[PDB]
Structure formats: structure tokens, C-alpha cells
């Protein structure tokens, strides 16, 4: 899956 | 005094995520849609006041509020995040809301689009007469 942001 | 009641409702949370044909100007690579509904097209508006999706700060006006069905947000973006969803009830005694951390994940280009379904069973122990009336539709 893609990057995640916080 | 001798009787006791537990009402159970089913909720369906989910989302769809697809890589776009072309990105947007900011580099948004995906189009996604997140929703709350009832199974088998049941009408949860009977007992649901509003649904609040808490987007990630990077979106303009992240608090997205749907007071009527469909309870859904359609966005474009580039990365997945944890998306608090609050479901508010047409009642007056706790609980008045329920919260879920919904994982809005995206797949990479070349990987299958997301079509995700998450179940939740809510139990209300001995609600008010009015609230039980609407829970039972």
C-alpha cells in the first residue's frame, strides 16, 4: 500500500 | 423490572480507492470515497442523527458532516490515513455518539483498487421507549 500520513 | 432489553444494530463502514487517470495539480493520485450505511440497504437514518468524518488536517475543512444519507465523503488525495468517524444518534441518553478509527488506505499504482467493507455490531442495553422505537425502524 501507498505512503501514510500522520 | 423483571424484563430487560438489548437492541443490536448493524453498521457498515467502508471505502473505495482508485488511482486516477492523471493526477491533479497538487499531485493527488487517488480518488476515494468513504461511507457509513446499513447492511442490505437498510435505513439507519431512523436512529442516526449525523455522521462526522474527521479528515486529515491537510484537507480543506476536514470536519465533513453528513446530516442525511448518503453518509459519505468523496475526496482525492495521495496518502492513506486514520479517519475518525463519529456516528450520532437520535437519542438523548448516553451513548449519544460512537467513534471508530477508520483506516483509509490506498493501494499503489499497478495494484488492485480498494473496495473495503468493515462490519460493526452496536448493542444498546435497555434504551428509552422512543429510542428503541426508532432503532427497530
Residue numbers in the entry:
A (entry chain B): 5 to 10
B (entry chain A): 1 to 137
What is written in the article reporting this PDB entry?
One of the major and widespread PTMs is acylation of the ε-amino group of lysine residues. Canonical acyllysine readers, bromodomain and double PHD finger (DPF), display comparable binding capabilities toward various short acyl chain modifications, and while the YEATS domain exhibits preference for crotonyllysine, it still associates albeit more weakly with other acyllysine marks. In this study, we elucidate the significance of π stacking components in targeting of acetyllysines by the YEATS domains and report a previously uncharacterized DNA-binding activity of the human AF9-YEATS domain. Collectively, our results have illuminated the mechanistic basis underlying distinct recognition of acyllysine PTMs by the YEATS domains of yeast Taf14 and human AF9, allowing us to develop a Taf14-YEATS module that selects for the crotonyl modification and discriminates against saturated acyl modifications.
